[PDB]
């Protein structure tokens, strides 16, 4: 309808009718628009979550640099924050803990060591790739898994003319106790190219 | 209800089309292939020879009339033939081992398969010039981009009705070449919107 | 139809298709009443004159200069070592899908555009 | 049908990966079944 347009003051009545507020970014409002703000902890307690959620959740009151105090959650196993400790907070809402609308950041913060046990989430737990884990990703050699089907095929069209590796052509693949050799050009191609290249 | 025995009516438009439940039915369609490849390779050599021999007597248009080839199609035959021969005489590389995109590789397979089933064409079958005919060429053919309308509405009367407003041509800028030198290329910018020519 | 006639006249005069030249016909003329047709006919004449007489043989400028400074280059077998490649087929390995419509426009489109109209490259000059 | 969005390089690499991967999966499945019958069945 156009009922709201009537009157010579239509340019001052309609525009003054605000629909609603801004639902988004309604909780995180003490940051003054900054992505992150540093703070210092002055109280450490354990707040019991509301029903029906049982258990205990660790929380701490962190004083922001802007002279404002607000509870912050410390996700992850273990605990190292104490009285008069500097920790960097971020956005995030916690349903179990009422009122808390902030989360701490591991690693970048001060006097906050790395997580105890975690392999799946790396960035989240600010855990760097260990040397042992990196070495495991390079081991790729599990191709030798011949079966009975290959044995019959080999001794039908690939046993007359076939060059072995060391110095010999004619081998004994027909023997059951013997094992059919591997390919000298295709088998383990990706691993061979990488190992022979780094050797310089 | 009405009589109109012709092949340009609303129902007759786009004949042999799925209108109903048959749209989702899978149907095989013929594979298209360019005309310059369906011709006999033998004739291509012959055509090329003539062109390269005497361009005056054997012009681009006259040569294509005898064999029934378009002016654009005949040009590609000489160009594609030239390069193939150049690499063989000079002993550079074989045509099979030549590097080319994947779009051409699949085209070559179709050309060989086309002849293996039916055979090569001894003479081309195409018209040199176009002809104004009623055909469906895309979705932009049955639409008026000037007036931006699909349905035309007019008054019904026996007396002469006033004519409609004719459109005007669109004036756009173009460029031309005046002086060309090995170390410099001079060009002129034409502005049709300028009243003073000078 | 015009081009057919014109093109035919020239051949008769020269008697190309004749083992034994018998020069008898040395005068060919065309007469047309229609002004419109007459004008058109003239055009055909021009085209006929081209590619026949050496004094009216045009040639694009880009290829004319190349043809003048001709040289003999000797290429040995060892000079084509890097020309050969391993892969047989080739195709685009990076989609042209733009990520940022605004960031790219104000970085590689606006600076390279100095005109308010879309103009394509003009054709070469004939010499 | 939705259009492709992945890089061509990745697309092409996926086919190469399957050349040696695929055959191993087929042999790995029959290895357990065949061995079970030769010792129990």
């Amino acid at each position: 309808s156009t009922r709201s347009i009537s009157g010579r003051l239509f340019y001052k009545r309609r525009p003054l009718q605000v629909p609603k507020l801004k639902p988004p970014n309604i909780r995180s409002k003490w940051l003054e628009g900054a992505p992150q703000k540093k703070g210092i902890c002055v109280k450490v307690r354990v707040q019991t979550p509301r029903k029906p959620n049982s258990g205990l959740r660790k929380v701490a009151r962190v004083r922001l640099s802007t002279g404002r105090t607000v509870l912050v959650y410390i996700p992850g196993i273990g605990h190292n924050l104490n009285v008069h400790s500097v920790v960097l907070v971020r956005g995030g809402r916690c349903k179990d803990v009422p009122g808390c609308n902030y989360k701490a950041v591991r690693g970048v913060a001060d006097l906050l060591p790395v997580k105890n046990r975690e392999r799946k989430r790396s960035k989240y737990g600010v855990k760097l790739s260990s040397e042992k884990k990196e070495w495991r990703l390079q081991r790729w050699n599990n191709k030798h898994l011949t079966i009975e089907k290959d044995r019959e095929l080999f001794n039908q069209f690939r046993w007359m003319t076939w060059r072995n590796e060391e110095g010999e052509m004619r081998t004994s693949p027909l023997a059951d106790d013997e094992e059919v050799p591997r390919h000298t050009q295709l088998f383990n191609r990706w691993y061979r190219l990488k190992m022979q290249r780094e050797g310089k | 209800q009405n009589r109109f025995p012709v092949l340009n009516t609303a129902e007759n438009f786009r004949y042999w089309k799925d209108r109903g439940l048959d749209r989702l039915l899978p149907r095989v369609f013929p594979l298209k292939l360019p005309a310059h490849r369906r011709v006999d390779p033998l004739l291509r050599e012959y055509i090329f020879f003539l062109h390269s021999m005497d361009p005056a007597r054997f012009s681009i248009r006259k040569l294509g009339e005898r064999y029934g080839l378009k002016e654009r199609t005949v040009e590609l035959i000489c160009r594609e033939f030239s390069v193939a021969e150049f690499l063989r005489r000079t002993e550079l590389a074989t045509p099979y081992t030549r590097r080319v995109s994947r779009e051409k590789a699949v085209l070559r397979m179709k050309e060989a398969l086309f002849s293996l089933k039916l055979g090569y064409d001894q003479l081309g079958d195409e018209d040199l010039d176009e002809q104004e005919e009623h055909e469906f060429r895309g979705f932009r053919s049955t639409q008026d981009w000037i007036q931006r309308q699909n349905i035309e509405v007019e008054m019904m009367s026996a007396f002469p009705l006033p004519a409609k407003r004719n459109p005007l041509p669109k004036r756009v800028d173009v460029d031309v070449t005046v002086h060309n030198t090995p170390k410099l290329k001079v060009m002129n910018w034409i502005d049709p919107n300028d009243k003073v020519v000078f | 139809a015009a081009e057919i006639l014109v093109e035919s006249a020239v051949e008769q005069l020269l008697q190309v298709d004749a083992v034994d030249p018998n020069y008898t016909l040395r005068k060919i003329t065309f007469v047309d009443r229609d002004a419109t047709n007459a004008a058109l006919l003239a055009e055909a004449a021009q085209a006929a004159k081209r590619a026949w007489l050496p004094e009216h043989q045009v040639v694009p400028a880009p290829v004319y200069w190349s043809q003048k400074q001709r040289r003999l280059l000797d290429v040995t077998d060892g000079m084509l070592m890097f020309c050969r490649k391993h892969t047989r087929l080739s195709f685009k390995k990076h989609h042209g899908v733009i990520r940022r419509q605004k960031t790219h426009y104000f970085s590689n489109v606006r600076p390279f555009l100095w005109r308010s109209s879309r103009v394509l490259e003009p054709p070469p000059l004939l010499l | 049908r939705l259009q492709s969005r992945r890089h061509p390089f990745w697309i092409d690499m996926g086919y190469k990966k399957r050349i040696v991967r695929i055959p191993y999966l087929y042999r790995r499945r029959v290895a357990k079944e065949e061995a079970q019958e030769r010792e129990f069945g």
Binding site: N141, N142, H144, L145, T146, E165, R182, T184, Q185, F187, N188, R189, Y191, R192, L193, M195, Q196, G199 | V83, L87, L92, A93, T97, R98, R99 | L80, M81, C83, R84, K85, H86, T87, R88 | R28, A31, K32, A35
Partner: peptide
């Protein structure tokens, strides 16, 4: 899966690169 890794090739057997035989225009 009964066979693990007994005979392996790391540097003992080299790999011949792909020769060049496709001239590019």
């Amino acid at each position: 899966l009964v066979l693990g890794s007994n005979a392996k090739s790391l540097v003992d057997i080299p790999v011949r690169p792909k020769p060049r035989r496709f001239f590019d225009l």
